[PDB]
Amino acid sequence: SALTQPASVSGSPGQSITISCTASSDFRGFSSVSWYQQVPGRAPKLLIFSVNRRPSGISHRFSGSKSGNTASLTISGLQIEDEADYHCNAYEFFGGGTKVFVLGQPKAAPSVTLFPPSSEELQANKATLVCLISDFYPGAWKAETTTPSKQSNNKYAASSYLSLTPEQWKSHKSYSCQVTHE
Amino acid sequence: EVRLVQSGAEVKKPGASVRVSCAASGYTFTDFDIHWLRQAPGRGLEWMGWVRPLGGGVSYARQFQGRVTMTRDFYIDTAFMDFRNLKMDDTALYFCARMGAAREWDFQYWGQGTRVLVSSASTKGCLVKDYFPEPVTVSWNSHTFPAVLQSSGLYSLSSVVCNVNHKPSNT
Amino acid sequence: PQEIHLENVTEEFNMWKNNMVEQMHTDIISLWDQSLKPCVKLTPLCVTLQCTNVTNNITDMRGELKNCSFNMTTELRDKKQKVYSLFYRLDVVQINSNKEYRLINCNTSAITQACPKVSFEPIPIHYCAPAGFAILKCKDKKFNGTGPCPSVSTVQCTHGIKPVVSTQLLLNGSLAEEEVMIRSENITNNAKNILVQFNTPVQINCTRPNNNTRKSIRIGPGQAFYATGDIIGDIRQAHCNVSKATWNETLGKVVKQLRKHFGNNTIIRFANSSGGDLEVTTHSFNCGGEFFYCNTSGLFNSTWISNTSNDSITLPCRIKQIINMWQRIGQAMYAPPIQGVIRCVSNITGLILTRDGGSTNSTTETFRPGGGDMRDNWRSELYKYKVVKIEPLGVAPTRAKRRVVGGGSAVGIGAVFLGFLGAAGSTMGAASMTLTVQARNLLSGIVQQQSNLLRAPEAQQHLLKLTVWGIKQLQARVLAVERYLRDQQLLGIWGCSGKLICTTNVPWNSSWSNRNLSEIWDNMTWLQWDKEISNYTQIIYGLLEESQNQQEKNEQDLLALD
Amino acid sequence: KLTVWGIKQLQARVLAVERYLRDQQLLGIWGCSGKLICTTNVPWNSSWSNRNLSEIWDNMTWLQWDKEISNYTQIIYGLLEESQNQQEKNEQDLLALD
Amino acid sequence: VFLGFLGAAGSTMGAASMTLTVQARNLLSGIVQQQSNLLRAPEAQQHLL
Amino acid sequence: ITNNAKNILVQFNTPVQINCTRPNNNTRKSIRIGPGQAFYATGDIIGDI
Amino acid sequence: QCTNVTNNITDMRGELKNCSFNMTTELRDKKQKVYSLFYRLDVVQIN
Ligand SMILES: *[C@@H]1O[C@H](CO)[C@@H](O[C@@H]2O[C@H](CO)[C@@H](O[C@@H]3O[C@H](CO[C@H]4O[C@H](CO[C@H]5O[C@H](CO)[C@@H](O)[C@H](O)[C@@H]5O)[C@@H](O)[C@H](O)[C@@H]4O)[C@@H](O)[C@H](O[C@H]4O[C@H](CO)[C@@H](O)[C@H](O)[C@@H]4O[C@H]4O[C@H](CO)[C@@H](O)[C@H](O)[C@@H]4O[C@H]4O[C@H](CO)[C@@H](O)[C@H](O)[C@@H]4O)[C@@H]3O)[C@H](O)[C@H]2NC(C)=O)[C@H](O)[C@H]1NC(C)=O
Ligand SMILES: *[C@@H]1O[C@H](CO)[C@@H](O[C@@H]2O[C@H](CO)[C@@H](O[C@@H]3O[C@H](CO[C@H]4O[C@H](CO)[C@@H](O)[C@H](O)[C@@H]4O)[C@@H](O)[C@H](O[C@H]4O[C@H](CO)[C@@H](O)[C@H](O)[C@@H]4O)[C@@H]3O)[C@H](O)[C@H]2NC(C)=O)[C@H](O)[C@H]1NC(C)=O
Ligand SMILES: *[C@@H]1O[C@H](CO)[C@@H](O[C@@H]2O[C@H](CO)[C@@H](O[C@@H]3O[C@H](CO[C@H]4O[C@H](CO)[C@@H](O)[C@H](O)[C@@H]4O)[C@@H](O)[C@H](O[C@H]4O[C@H](CO)[C@@H](O)[C@H](O)[C@@H]4O)[C@@H]3O)[C@H](O)[C@H]2NC(C)=O)[C@H](O)[C@H]1NC(C)=O
Ligand SMILES: *[C@@H]1O[C@H](CO)[C@@H](O[C@@H]2O[C@H](CO)[C@@H](O[C@@H]3O[C@H](CO)[C@@H](O)[C@H](O)[C@@H]3O)[C@H](O)[C@H]2NC(C)=O)[C@H](O)[C@H]1NC(C)=O
Ligand SMILES: *[C@@H]1O[C@H](CO)[C@@H](O[C@@H]2O[C@H](CO)[C@@H](O[C@@H]3O[C@H](CO)[C@@H](O)[C@H](O)[C@@H]3O)[C@H](O)[C@H]2NC(C)=O)[C@H](O)[C@H]1NC(C)=O
Ligand SMILES: *[C@@H]1O[C@H](CO)[C@@H](O[C@@H]2O[C@H](CO)[C@@H](O)[C@H](O)[C@H]2NC(C)=O)[C@H](O)[C@H]1NC(C)=O
Ligand SMILES: *[C@@H]1O[C@H](CO)[C@@H](O[C@@H]2O[C@H](CO)[C@@H](O)[C@H](O)[C@H]2NC(C)=O)[C@H](O)[C@H]1NC(C)=O
Ligand SMILES: *[C@@H]1O[C@H](CO)[C@@H](O[C@@H]2O[C@H](CO)[C@@H](O)[C@H](O)[C@H]2NC(C)=O)[C@H](O)[C@H]1NC(C)=O
Ligand SMILES: *[C@@H]1O[C@H](CO)[C@@H](O)[C@H](O)[C@H]1NC(C)=O
Ligand SMILES: *[C@@H]1O[C@H](CO)[C@@H](O)[C@H](O)[C@H]1NC(C)=O
Ligand SMILES: *[C@@H]1O[C@H](CO)[C@@H](O)[C@H](O)[C@H]1NC(C)=O
Ligand SMILES: *[C@@H]1O[C@H](CO)[C@@H](O)[C@H](O)[C@H]1NC(C)=O
Ligand SMILES: *[C@@H]1O[C@H](CO)[C@@H](O)[C@H](O)[C@H]1NC(C)=O
Ligand SMILES: *[C@@H]1O[C@H](CO)[C@@H](O)[C@H](O)[C@H]1NC(C)=O
Ligand SMILES: *[C@@H]1O[C@H](CO)[C@@H](O)[C@H](O)[C@H]1NC(C)=O
Ligand SMILES: *[C@@H]1O[C@H](CO)[C@@H](O)[C@H](O)[C@H]1NC(C)=O
Ligand SMILES: *[C@@H]1O[C@H](CO)[C@@H](O)[C@H](O)[C@H]1NC(C)=O
Ligand SMILES: *[C@@H]1O[C@H](CO)[C@@H](O)[C@H](O)[C@H]1NC(C)=O
Ligand SMILES: *[C@@H]1O[C@H](CO)[C@@H](O)[C@H](O)[C@H]1NC(C)=O
Ligand SMILES: *[C@@H]1O[C@H](CO)[C@@H](O)[C@H](O)[C@H]1NC(C)=O
Ligand SMILES: *[C@@H]1O[C@H](CO)[C@@H](O)[C@H](O)[C@H]1NC(C)=O
Ligand SMILES: *[C@@H]1O[C@H](CO)[C@@H](O)[C@H](O)[C@H]1NC(C)=O
């Protein structure tokens, strides 16, 4: 990363927030910038090819200007469709991405459903405690970490596992799990 | 109607030297240069190389010298990228893009991408059976949770509302 | 040739968007197809070959040459003939101790043989502009690629450019003056190529030591195919010899200039070709009728940083006979063999480099020579030119008014005339002193029988018909007439038919310009004047065309009406 | 199309226009735009011909006349094009200049 | 009340004689909006053709 | 209209839409028949005739 | 040499034919036996 980008940004819907693109003290001929809106894990979308020019399929709310060695992108009338990973490139050099956060959204209680080890599970002398954390928002063994993923009902769902011993599961009368949200 | 089509997801042990195809359609392929970009899950986009269709000229990045090689074929309007001696650090998603009509360093068209993961694991690999690689097909009577990555590399998951078909087993 | 130097003219042109390079490009490509179309076609030569390696002692000599016998047709349809020939390794591919070999283009494209009589030698050709157009020539020795040229002149046709197809090294080009030039559209962007121009020529000696022979085997009625015969003498490689002292010295001139853009103390390394087809990877050039392909790794392995035998450099060069110039699809040419030993000696006047790129900055910089496109061979010579069309109808306000409707001399030695378009940098008053200079040149030859006087010789265009330039001339002479008669038609409605300067009764509105008569005519060029009035020039042309000169007609005859 | 005489006609009709507009362009700089006969102020030098007005116009064909003046016809066309008709323009508007 | 090109073809000889520059503009070159000669200026249109 | 030899041309005021199809799902087969020359022939027909 | 395309004849009187011919190839000496399909209107019978 010859340049640098802000780690995270946050703002309320409808508010204008700016993004920056750093420049090194040894940069040469920094005269053009193109910004992209990359859906997390999908193909990037070109927001503005030149410093100020915009393609046809891109909305008018996206804008960009350059002052000295810093390139600035400003969003107006923010919506949730706009939330994605953003990157500013100068020639071949790119950036580490700018995380976006939209405030706010009501929280949700985790639909925790823990299931005891199956009959065939303990037969192989391998104990496995499975705990499912679904229908919880936002995305965040007494007495194996899975990152939460989006769902169709605009909620996140994760899971947790534990490799245990049947002799250790039969020595203790019971087990539980703690899923603290916010 | 211009769109770039990439190859499918592939898994390989270190030193396997995978090649990726980028199909071009809807425009005169022999005009614009094709670029290979790779993005890690916890990193930003990285530029690997550009190769133009007329003459095959190609410029490769300093760190990929002796490791990568790119070519193309005019008859199939496709540019290829040979990445030899792949390493554990180089696992990420590989994108091939085309510069916009403005001829500045901007990318107006991209591809769906290919998934290249390098690891050391056996190809053979309700409660889930060890089903490595990651893709599974869950069905009830002919709510699913994501999988977890253990230290061994095997993937475990759970499905609550089976006989999940396994690609390595071909049930 | 008449070249005019313009005083106080600062006209800039952009080398990369210059339209003159693409016209020539499409011009050479069209010219090639017009020469190969009448030549014989080798459609029956796409036959399974049975090749035996040419007589050679294998010490590794890994000869590319093959000796292939094929069942070829003859003058009669029912008869055949078994004849042999020689083909390099690059022309034949294996089709699954003689084995079966196939010509490389048979699976992709048809092939046609270049006529033996036509010569591929580059000759100088000048490109001129049609009557009513002008070409501006920069005369700045230190001229950058894009930007203002402080000293600009004008010329009818450019100095002839020898069209030399060269991939990695420009050949027989125009030398730069003083320091070598490093012209680039954007030196920071690696995608654009880096064109260089030399001030001191680097001589190069290339040969094909193999004393081949030509064998004409009739393959059709009135059609004859030319194949290589027995090779007399030692089997040797085609090589190019360049003196190392001179190449080391010139390479030191290019590396010095490059530091200005990237810094005084930085690592400037030179590397080899990083990939591509055989064209881009090697110094593909034509000589004596054949087409060499020289690995240039010995020229481009060096490392320069900060400051501080007499034998030549030799280049292993391959030779190919089946080629597709300019990466065209569906076409291929077989160059006939050249009997005897051939020698080449040319001048190296420029290179086409490339930026390496990479994530690291200010650590190391390597330049890789490349020949991605043939257009960059034309930008190396058409950089100092630009095409402009002259517009002779410039309006301006003056207190003079139309002769009343009711109403009804120096003989020479005018001083210091500037020639055609010479008054473009002088004041509007001084420029208005010379109007017949342009009016002579708007139509017909600008100078010395420039165009119309030339098209008079017979059988030049008749024989030419529509081939090549024949259609170029008709479009250039018809457009000339259409632009001249357009201004006269503009006058015919505007009055002033026979007058270079006419004043007609039309009020000049103050909103078009707030400057007074003095400041406008005291120190302004007509070029700057046309810019400010450009927003209103169309309206002036509408009020002046009818209200000024058709209201008169309706009133002028009413006045005499019964 | 372009077969045979088709290209012969375009070269014959374009050359016709180019020669007609050449003379009119020669007049446009020389004055006399709409006039078959125009007299403009230019002195006739005696070195071009020593014959008097009578002998020239009494018994001479224009063909014989073009032969003797052929050596000087180009110079006449240079003095008459600007000194005769462009000096007027520079003076004619100066006369009405503010 | 100008009638445009050839608009005075149905009006009286006196009224039609009032507009003569209308036709004289259109006798040569494009009648309207760069109709012909202005168009043939783009490059490689007819050269390639 | 009285002479039968001349055709009778009609012009509609309301368009009549027409739907045409070739239900056979043919396939293209390019078999090279010459150098640089390729002939296109119909292949296997998928589906009902 | 044509063979009627695979069809159940209820009359279906298919115009389509399936014809194999000795066609040339990239090389002059070589040949190839390839097939194709042609409608009834494109081919005529040669006795
Ligand atoms: C009376 O008037 C009627 C109304 O005008 C006439 O009806 C018209 O009839 C014509 C055919 O004669 C139809 O044209 C064809 O329509 C096909 C279906 O169109 C679909 O796609 C349309 C556009 O989609 C593109 O653009 C949209 C955005 O606008 C974009 O979202 C989308 O992703 C895509 O980029 C869409 O508008 C339609 O609703 C449909 O969805 C269309 O497929 C046809 O294209 C074919 O064929 C034409 C003509 O032959 C070719 O020029 C095209 O290149 C393409 O040909 C394909 O096969 C070739 C074989 O030679 C290949 O060489 C081509 O490369 C190509 O292969 C394709 O796939 C490749 C693989 O990716 C691509 O690389 C290629 O690019 C190609 O995509 C054609 O457009 C009209 O649509 C129809 N009208 C209407 C309103 O539908 C009627 O005919 C008139 N009467 C008479 C007697 O003529
Ligand atoms: C390396 O590559 C970069 C691009 O990748 C090149 O940068 C281009 O440089 C040219 C020349 O300076 C630029 O052209 C100019 O663009 C202006 C518009 O953008 C700027 O100015 C506006 C305000 O005017 C700002 O709002 C905006 O943010 C930018 O700062 C034009 O205004 C210029 O003039 C135009 O408008 C006037 C209006 O009157 C017209 O009269 C002119 O004719 C003209 O139309 C001018 O066009 C260009 O924008 C830059 N970017 C791009 C993407 O091309 C470098 O030049 C290049 N080389 C190096 C660094 O050596
Ligand atoms: C100028 O450009 C040239 C050509 O691109 C560059 O040189 C390449 O350089 C390498 C050495 O760096 C050459 O080496 C060749 O290696 C081939 C295969 O071995 C490679 O891979 C194995 C493992 O598979 C490694 O152990 C080995 O070290 C190599 O990395 C050999 O097969 C080659 O032999 C070939 O030629 C002989 C005849 O000479 C044939 O009989 C063989 O069948 C085979 O064709 C060779 O040993 C390679 O030739 C060069 N070519 C390539 C592929 O790029 C230069 O580095 C570059 N710069 C300069 C300054 O010259
Ligand atoms: C040049 O053309 C001549 C023919 O005009 C070629 O001679 C022929 O070569 C073929 C093999 O390619 C011989 O075929 C033989 O067929 C028998 C079976 O019948 C088989 O058992 C043999 O192994 C072989 O395949 C053929 O007999 C022979 N002679 C003829 C046709 O009279 C000659 O090889 C060609 N030379 C070239 C292509 O360089
Ligand atoms: C495609 O071409 C091949 C030849 O390359 C054809 O094969 C040949 O077919 C002919 C008949 O048309 C055979 O002729 C036979 O000759 C004997 C007498 O010698 C006669 O008694 C038989 O009744 C028959 O006429 C020939 O032997 C055969 N094979 C060869 C030449 O090797 C093939 O039929 C062609 N397919 C087509 C046209 O669809
Ligand atoms: C290429 O060959 C030419 C001759 O064909 C060489 O020119 C000679 O240069 C030497 C001095 O270096 C003179 O003494 C000879 O008289 C020159 N030859 C002739 C015929 O005049 C040239 O030096 C060679 N250059 C390279 C790089 O090989
Ligand atoms: C280009 O030429 C250079 C020599 O100037 C070649 O370098 C050699 O190729 C041989 C194989 O025959 C290798 O064994 C050598 O190691 C190569 N040289 C070096 C310095 O590594 C180079 O391979 C040639 N490349 C091409 C594409 O022709
Ligand atoms: C470029 O020139 C250098 C020498 O300046 C070459 O270096 C050779 O390196 C090998 C070891 O790999 C040594 O054994 C040789 O002795 C070196 N050459 C000399 C003349 O001493 C380098 O290989 C050259 N590269 C190319 C591509 O030609
Ligand atoms: C115009 O050019 C002349 C030289 O021909 C020079 O002497 C004069 O100073 C220049 N004036 C201006 C305004 O450029
Ligand atoms: C032929 O080449 C071989 C390579 O080993 C060499 O030993 C032999 O002396 C050479 N002989 C001749 C006659 O060229
Ligand atoms: C096949 O090889 C032999 C021996 O090298 C040679 O004499 C003959 O000409 C070759 N070609 C043929 C038989 O077509
Ligand atoms: C000749 O080249 C070498 C590097 O190969 C360089 O060090 C030396 O300075 C060069 N000669 C001169 C006179 O600069
Ligand atoms: C050389 O480098 C020095 C120090 O950076 C700088 O001051 C000077 O301008 C440079 N001179 C040249 C000729 O590049
Ligand atoms: C000048 O003419 C324009 C119309 O061309 C008119 O609108 C304006 O009022 C006039 N006067 C001034 C002072 O601009
Ligand atoms: C108008 O001309 C006068 C005299 O040259 C000058 O002093 C004045 O500044 C000019 N004003 C404008 C607005 O052009
Ligand atoms: C033009 O030149 C005159 C001197 O001849 C000077 O007084 C005036 O300020 C100049 N104006 C401009 C715009 O250069
Ligand atoms: C030309 O007119 C435009 C508005 O149409 C104006 O913005 C521009 O400044 C004007 N330029 C000149 C030189 O009058
Ligand atoms: C006539 O004009 C010529 C120049 O055209 C001049 O040399 C000569 O002296 C003039 N007078 C006479 C009497 O020839
Ligand atoms: C000049 O004209 C007069 C009267 O016609 C004639 O007598 C005389 O001989 C002529 N002389 C010359 C030199 O032409
Ligand atoms: C021309 O004709 C006249 C009679 O009309 C005669 O007097 C004169 O001598 C003739 N001159 C010549 C050169 O014939
Ligand atoms: C024409 O001029 C040449 C000298 O240039 C002279 O020798 C010749 O006699 C002249 N002929 C006439 C008819 O004046
Ligand atoms: C085929 O066609 C015949 C026509 O008699 C019909 O009776 C029969 O049922 C059909 N069968 C199929 C499988 O299409």
Side-chain angles (χ1 to χ4, degrees), chain C residues 38 43 57 135 139 172 185 213 267 290 382 422 424 441 513 520 534 538 542 559:
Chain C
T43 62
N57 183 29
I135 297 177
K139 316 189 69 63
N172 298 341
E185 189 183 29
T213 45
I267 297 181
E290 274 177 17
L382 290 174
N441 301 15
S513 63
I520 288 177
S534 57
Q538 198 60 25
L559 192 148

mmCIF file of all heavy atoms in Angstrom, chain C residues 38 43 57 135 139 172 185 213 267 290 382 402 422 424 441 448 513 520 534 538 542 559, unseen atoms left out:
data_model
loop_
_atom_site.group_PDB
_atom_site.id
_atom_site.type_symbol
_atom_site.label_atom_id
_atom_site.label_comp_id
_atom_site.label_asym_id
_atom_site.label_seq_id
_atom_site.Cartn_x
_atom_site.Cartn_y
_atom_site.Cartn_z
ATOM 1 N N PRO C 38 -2.308 -8.460 -56.012
ATOM 2 C CA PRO C 38 -2.010 -8.990 -57.352
ATOM 3 C C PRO C 38 -1.009 -10.134 -57.372
ATOM 4 O O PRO C 38 -0.843 -10.764 -58.426
ATOM 5 C CB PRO C 38 -1.445 -7.767 -58.088
ATOM 6 C CG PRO C 38 -0.802 -6.976 -57.011
ATOM 7 C CD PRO C 38 -1.721 -7.119 -55.830
ATOM 8 N N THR C 43 -2.077 -21.134 -51.862
ATOM 9 C CA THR C 43 -3.103 -21.987 -51.274
ATOM 10 C C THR C 43 -2.784 -23.479 -51.413
ATOM 11 O O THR C 43 -3.118 -24.246 -50.502
ATOM 12 C CB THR C 43 -4.479 -21.673 -51.878
ATOM 13 O OG1 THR C 43 -4.479 -21.935 -53.286
ATOM 14 C CG2 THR C 43 -4.837 -20.213 -51.647
ATOM 15 N N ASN C 57 26.586 -30.603 -38.447
ATOM 16 C CA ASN C 57 27.208 -31.322 -37.343
ATOM 17 C C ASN C 57 26.618 -30.818 -36.032
ATOM 18 O O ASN C 57 26.752 -29.636 -35.700
ATOM 19 C CB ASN C 57 28.725 -31.140 -37.354
ATOM 20 C CG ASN C 57 29.412 -31.926 -36.255
ATOM 21 O OD1 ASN C 57 28.927 -32.975 -35.831
ATOM 22 N ND2 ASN C 57 30.543 -31.418 -35.781
ATOM 23 N N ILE C 135 0.036 23.067 -42.140
ATOM 24 C CA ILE C 135 0.769 22.195 -41.228
ATOM 25 C C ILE C 135 1.773 23.046 -40.464
ATOM 26 O O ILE C 135 2.598 23.739 -41.073
ATOM 27 C CB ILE C 135 1.479 21.053 -41.970
ATOM 28 C CG1 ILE C 135 0.458 20.140 -42.656
ATOM 29 C CG2 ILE C 135 2.352 20.263 -41.009
ATOM 30 C CD1 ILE C 135 1.087 19.023 -43.464
ATOM 31 N N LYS C 139 9.945 24.071 -34.173
ATOM 32 C CA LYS C 139 11.385 24.158 -34.384
ATOM 33 C C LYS C 139 12.144 24.290 -33.069
ATOM 34 O O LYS C 139 13.295 24.738 -33.063
ATOM 35 C CB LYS C 139 11.717 25.328 -35.312
ATOM 36 C CG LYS C 139 10.802 25.438 -36.522
ATOM 37 C CD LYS C 139 11.320 26.463 -37.515
ATOM 38 C CE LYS C 139 12.597 25.980 -38.187
ATOM 39 N NZ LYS C 139 12.365 24.744 -38.982
ATOM 40 N N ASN C 172 17.096 4.425 -38.806
ATOM 41 C CA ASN C 172 17.191 5.474 -39.826
ATOM 42 C C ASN C 172 16.188 6.600 -39.575
ATOM 43 O O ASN C 172 15.524 7.084 -40.495
ATOM 44 C CB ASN C 172 17.019 4.891 -41.230
ATOM 45 C CG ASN C 172 18.105 3.893 -41.577
ATOM 46 O OD1 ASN C 172 19.166 3.873 -40.951
ATOM 47 N ND2 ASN C 172 17.850 3.064 -42.585
ATOM 48 N N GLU C 185 3.701 10.336 -22.909
ATOM 49 C CA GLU C 185 2.404 10.932 -22.606
ATOM 50 C C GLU C 185 2.247 11.167 -21.111
ATOM 51 O O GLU C 185 1.671 12.175 -20.691
ATOM 52 C CB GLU C 185 1.279 10.040 -23.132
ATOM 53 C CG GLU C 185 -0.106 10.665 -23.050
ATOM 54 C CD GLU C 185 -1.202 9.723 -23.519
ATOM 55 O OE1 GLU C 185 -1.026 8.492 -23.392
ATOM 56 O OE2 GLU C 185 -2.239 10.211 -24.018
ATOM 57 N N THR C 213 19.933 -20.128 -51.871
ATOM 58 C CA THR C 213 19.677 -20.050 -53.301
ATOM 59 C C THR C 213 18.175 -20.102 -53.543
ATOM 60 O O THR C 213 17.421 -20.675 -52.750
ATOM 61 C CB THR C 213 20.379 -21.175 -54.081
ATOM 62 O OG1 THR C 213 20.186 -22.427 -53.410
ATOM 63 C CG2 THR C 213 21.871 -20.894 -54.214
ATOM 64 N N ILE C 267 18.403 4.062 -8.352
ATOM 65 C CA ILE C 267 18.891 2.912 -9.107
ATOM 66 C C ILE C 267 18.173 2.855 -10.447
ATOM 67 O O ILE C 267 16.946 2.714 -10.507
ATOM 68 C CB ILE C 267 18.693 1.612 -8.317
ATOM 69 C CG1 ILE C 267 19.518 1.637 -7.029
ATOM 70 C CG2 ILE C 267 19.065 0.411 -9.174
ATOM 71 C CD1 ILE C 267 19.401 0.370 -6.205
ATOM 72 N N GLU C 290 14.336 -10.079 -46.307
ATOM 73 C CA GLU C 290 13.976 -11.032 -45.267
ATOM 74 C C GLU C 290 13.749 -10.277 -43.966
ATOM 75 O O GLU C 290 13.968 -9.065 -43.882
ATOM 76 C CB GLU C 290 15.038 -12.121 -45.105
ATOM 77 C CG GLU C 290 14.849 -13.293 -46.049
ATOM 78 C CD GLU C 290 15.948 -14.321 -45.922
ATOM 79 O OE1 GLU C 290 16.664 -14.288 -44.901
ATOM 80 O OE2 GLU C 290 16.094 -15.160 -46.838
ATOM 81 N N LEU C 382 6.440 12.230 -36.560
ATOM 82 C CA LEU C 382 5.357 13.193 -36.689
ATOM 83 C C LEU C 382 5.121 13.984 -35.407
ATOM 84 O O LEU C 382 4.073 14.624 -35.271
ATOM 85 C CB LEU C 382 4.067 12.485 -37.110
ATOM 86 C CG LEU C 382 4.011 11.924 -38.529
ATOM 87 C CD1 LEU C 382 2.734 11.126 -38.731
ATOM 88 C CD2 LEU C 382 4.104 13.045 -39.545
ATOM 89 N N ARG C 402 -21.295 52.071 -44.097
ATOM 90 C CA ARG C 402 -21.668 51.866 -45.497
ATOM 91 C C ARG C 402 -21.896 53.132 -46.295
ATOM 92 O O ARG C 402 -22.432 54.112 -45.769
ATOM 93 C CB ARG C 402 -22.959 51.049 -45.576
ATOM 94 N N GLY C 422 2.441 34.610 -42.211
ATOM 95 C CA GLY C 422 3.512 35.207 -41.433
ATOM 96 C C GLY C 422 3.024 36.246 -40.444
ATOM 97 O O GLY C 422 3.657 36.467 -39.406
ATOM 98 N N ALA C 424 0.488 36.069 -38.517
ATOM 99 C CA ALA C 424 -0.406 35.478 -37.527
ATOM 100 C C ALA C 424 -0.046 35.910 -36.111
ATOM 101 O O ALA C 424 -0.914 35.923 -35.230
ATOM 102 C CB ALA C 424 -0.384 33.955 -37.641
ATOM 103 N N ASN C 441 -3.447 31.637 -51.465
ATOM 104 C CA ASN C 441 -3.148 30.286 -51.023
ATOM 105 C C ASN C 441 -4.369 29.516 -50.542
ATOM 106 O O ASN C 441 -4.253 28.313 -50.282
ATOM 107 C CB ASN C 441 -2.095 30.339 -49.918
ATOM 108 C CG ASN C 441 -0.816 31.001 -50.376
ATOM 109 O OD1 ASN C 441 -0.791 31.671 -51.409
ATOM 110 N ND2 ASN C 441 0.254 30.817 -49.617
ATOM 111 N N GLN C 448 5.143 26.844 -55.168
ATOM 112 C CA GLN C 448 5.837 26.008 -56.180
ATOM 113 C C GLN C 448 4.908 24.938 -56.750
ATOM 114 O O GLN C 448 5.276 23.760 -56.592
ATOM 115 C CB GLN C 448 7.092 25.379 -55.575
ATOM 116 N N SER C 513 -18.052 42.756 -26.987
ATOM 117 C CA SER C 513 -16.743 43.091 -26.444
ATOM 118 C C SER C 513 -16.778 44.534 -25.966
ATOM 119 O O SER C 513 -17.368 45.394 -26.625
ATOM 120 C CB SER C 513 -15.634 42.904 -27.487
ATOM 121 O OG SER C 513 -15.815 43.780 -28.585
ATOM 122 N N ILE C 520 -7.901 47.029 -29.338
ATOM 123 C CA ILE C 520 -8.144 45.865 -30.186
ATOM 124 C C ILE C 520 -7.146 45.825 -31.340
ATOM 125 O O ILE C 520 -6.518 44.793 -31.604
ATOM 126 C CB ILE C 520 -9.598 45.861 -30.691
ATOM 127 C CG1 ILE C 520 -10.556 45.526 -29.548
ATOM 128 C CG2 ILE C 520 -9.770 44.886 -31.842
ATOM 129 C CD1 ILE C 520 -12.016 45.573 -29.938
ATOM 130 N N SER C 534 -15.762 34.201 -30.885
ATOM 131 C CA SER C 534 -16.244 32.883 -31.290
ATOM 132 C C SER C 534 -17.637 32.597 -30.746
ATOM 133 O O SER C 534 -18.431 31.914 -31.406
ATOM 134 C CB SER C 534 -15.266 31.802 -30.828
ATOM 135 O OG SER C 534 -15.082 31.851 -29.423
ATOM 136 N N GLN C 538 -21.415 33.253 -34.849
ATOM 137 C CA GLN C 538 -22.553 32.761 -35.658
ATOM 138 C C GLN C 538 -23.621 33.853 -35.762
ATOM 139 O O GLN C 538 -24.091 34.077 -36.886
ATOM 140 C CB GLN C 538 -23.100 31.447 -35.104
ATOM 141 C CG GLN C 538 -23.956 30.685 -36.106
ATOM 142 C CD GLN C 538 -23.195 30.312 -37.355
ATOM 143 O OE1 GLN C 538 -21.974 30.193 -37.346
ATOM 144 N NE2 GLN C 538 -23.914 30.127 -38.448
ATOM 145 N N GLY C 542 -25.543 35.946 -39.147
ATOM 146 C CA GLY C 542 -26.950 35.887 -39.487
ATOM 147 C C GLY C 542 -27.553 37.257 -39.710
ATOM 148 O O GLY C 542 -28.369 37.449 -40.616
ATOM 149 N N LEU C 559 -36.624 51.459 -54.538
ATOM 150 C CA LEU C 559 -36.212 52.830 -54.824
ATOM 151 C C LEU C 559 -36.372 53.153 -56.305
ATOM 152 O O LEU C 559 -36.817 54.249 -56.665
ATOM 153 C CB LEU C 559 -34.764 53.046 -54.373
ATOM 154 C CG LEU C 559 -34.213 54.476 -54.307
ATOM 155 C CD1 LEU C 559 -33.181 54.603 -53.194
ATOM 156 C CD2 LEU C 559 -33.623 54.926 -55.641
#
